[PDB]
Enzyme design. Sequence first.
Site, mmCIF file in Angstrom:
data_model
loop_
_atom_site.group_PDB
_atom_site.id
_atom_site.type_symbol
_atom_site.label_atom_id
_atom_site.label_comp_id
_atom_site.label_asym_id
_atom_site.label_seq_id
_atom_site.Cartn_x
_atom_site.Cartn_y
_atom_site.Cartn_z
ATOM 1 N N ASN A 292 0.790 -1.233 0.055
ATOM 2 C CA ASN A 292 0.022 0.141 0.064
ATOM 3 C C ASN A 292 0.720 1.318 -0.006
ATOM 4 O O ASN A 292 1.577 1.206 1.073
ATOM 5 C CB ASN A 292 -0.699 0.023 1.527
ATOM 6 C CG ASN A 292 -1.867 1.014 1.261
ATOM 7 O OD1 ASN A 292 -2.363 1.571 0.225
ATOM 8 N ND2 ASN A 292 -2.157 1.743 2.329
ATOM 9 N N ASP B 30 5.520 -5.140 2.508
ATOM 10 C CA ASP B 30 4.281 -4.390 3.148
ATOM 11 C C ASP B 30 3.415 -5.144 3.115
ATOM 12 O O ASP B 30 3.572 -6.588 3.208
ATOM 13 C CB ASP B 30 4.031 -2.964 2.183
ATOM 14 C CG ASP B 30 3.069 -2.275 2.963
ATOM 15 O OD1 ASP B 30 1.988 -2.005 2.718
ATOM 16 O OD2 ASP B 30 3.526 -1.497 4.133
ATOM 17 N N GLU C 94 10.818 -4.539 4.690
ATOM 18 C CA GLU C 94 9.547 -3.502 5.179
ATOM 19 C C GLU C 94 8.286 -4.396 5.364
ATOM 20 O O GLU C 94 7.052 -3.719 4.948
ATOM 21 C CB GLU C 94 9.403 -2.299 4.440
ATOM 22 C CG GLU C 94 10.575 -1.413 4.542
ATOM 23 C CD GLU C 94 10.624 -0.670 5.990
ATOM 24 O OE1 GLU C 94 11.416 -0.310 6.677
ATOM 25 O OE2 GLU C 94 9.357 -0.269 6.077
ATOM 26 N N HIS D 175 10.646 3.495 3.696
ATOM 27 C CA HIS D 175 9.564 2.686 3.642
ATOM 28 C C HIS D 175 9.931 1.863 2.282
ATOM 29 O O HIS D 175 9.926 0.692 1.993
ATOM 30 C CB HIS D 175 8.287 2.817 4.013
ATOM 31 C CG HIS D 175 7.230 1.837 3.728
ATOM 32 N ND1 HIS D 175 7.310 1.000 4.658
ATOM 33 C CD2 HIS D 175 6.431 1.467 2.893
ATOM 34 C CE1 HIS D 175 6.450 -0.160 4.207
ATOM 35 N NE2 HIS D 175 5.811 0.236 3.139
#
Length: 301
Positions: free
Chosen positions: A40, A107, A131, A272
Amino acid sequence: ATGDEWWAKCKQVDVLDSEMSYYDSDPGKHKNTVIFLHGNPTSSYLWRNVIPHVEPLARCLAPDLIGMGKSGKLPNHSYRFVDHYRYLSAWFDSVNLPEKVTIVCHDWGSGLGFHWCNEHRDRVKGIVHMESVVDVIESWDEWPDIEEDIALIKSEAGEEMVLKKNFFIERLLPSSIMRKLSEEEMDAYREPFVEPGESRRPTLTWPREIPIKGDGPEDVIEIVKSYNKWLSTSKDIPKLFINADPGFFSNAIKKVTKNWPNQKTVTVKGLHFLQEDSPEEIGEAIADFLNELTKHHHHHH
Ligand SMILES: O=C(Cc1ccc(O)cc1)Nc1ncc(-c2ccc(O)cc2)nc1Cc1ccccc1
């Protein structure tokens, strides 16, 4: 590389009542195969400068999650983790995968990939994760301090921030890349979400799913707890953690995975969205990991 240039190289395949767009480097070729899973608010476009380093060694697939990239939108605007898994799971079954694959994930794409691996353990060649969603958040002292932001996003202000002001695309995404995106790179990311309103719903539902002990949804928590338990003792599954320096979740991932067997760590420069700052070094580390896999080393500890 424009958005139209990226998606021009991509395929579509029906999935359940919808369809999903995806990059496939070698359709129909049964060989070493690597699946790249974004999160996202990104899409397969996130992997565009990483895949060229891996393509020589493997067929590379990089799907657009449902409701994202160039994949279909869901008419009921329900994009919970289980909704995403429904479509991704069916996607895995429709792109002619060989018996075992390697998952590269980021993610929420690592939430989906970890879970898929947990449910198809006999098909996992290896996992590269970065991440990534590796555990339930039990203390805000072990994790980046987004407690108040998550509360904010869970309230009615969330709809305004995302559906109307596209917060994740216009503010979060560039804030956690170190370099400045070109404006055709930014439009590539804006493209699936240009219509305000519910087309942006996936970038709001995703942080609403974050597995927080005593605050996150029980179905996502049970899924995460159960693939974390599996990964923590997955001595037969070779794993690469790509650590982002300074990263975002990277520091918390570093210590959540201390105990995990058969995991090597490589550190690269990034916040990120590390793929936009060190695409080549992420690509090289995957190629190295894939070359080591073929040796199928019998590890002692
Ligand atoms: O919910 C997630 C997914 C997740 C990823 C890894 C992990 O260990 C656990 C969960 N991410 C998320 N969810 C919510 C927020 C967030 C929301 C509002 C805000 O003001 C700041 C961050 N951020 C993020 C991540 C992020 C993305 C981009 C830039 C920075 C951080």
